[PDB]
């Protein structure tokens, strides 16, 4: 009857464990790539919104509204006093 | 009758699933490249508007 | 989502209005 060698069984078990872990590593890489792609898409959407707002006068209109509101507040304070 | 060895069957299953996962990894790489290209195009459009 | 609507502008307007109201209240109390 052959005499078993303890080290060989442990080495085989470790090899099987490594083979199992490689697939989990690949899955983690896929998840990371997907997350980066979604972040890039969100950045693109933000840049597109910025382009759309800058093309029109909305950015300047908001500043004009702020200045007009400040002036109206000053006028109201003058009237109340 | 030949006697099966579970270790070999498990190794073959792991190899098949790894070959399956490689395709998904390639698809994820393609998606990331496409997203980066679209982001670069958006940046170019913004810079053209600035010009 | 916040930038698409006027929430960012609305908060600044609310801050300005609150400052004006505080100045008016200070004037009234004095």
From Swiss-Prot, chain B:
Lineage: Viruses, Duplodnaviria, Heunggongvirae, Uroviricota, Caudoviricetes
Record protein name field: Probable portal protein
Native organism: Enterobacteria phage N4 (Bacteriophage N4)
Role: Forms the portal vertex of the capsid. This portal plays critical roles in head assembly, genome packaging, neck/tail attachment, and genome ejection. The portal protein multimerizes as a single ring-shaped homododecamer arranged around a central channel.
Location(s), subcellular: Virion
Quaternary assembly: Homododecamer.
Full-protein interval shown: 612 to 662 of 763
């Amino acid at each position: 009857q052959p005499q078993p060698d303890p080290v060989q069984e442990q080495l085989k078990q470790l090899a099987v464990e490594k083979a199992q872990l490689e697939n989990e590593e690949l899955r983690s890489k896929i998840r990371l790539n997907d997350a980066q792609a979604q972040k890039a898409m969100a950045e693109r959407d933000n840049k597109n919104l910025d382009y759309l707002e800058q093309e029109s006068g909305t950015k300047h209109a908001r500043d004009l509204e702020k200045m007009k509101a400040q002036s109206q507040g000053n006028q109201q304070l003058e009237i109340t006093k």
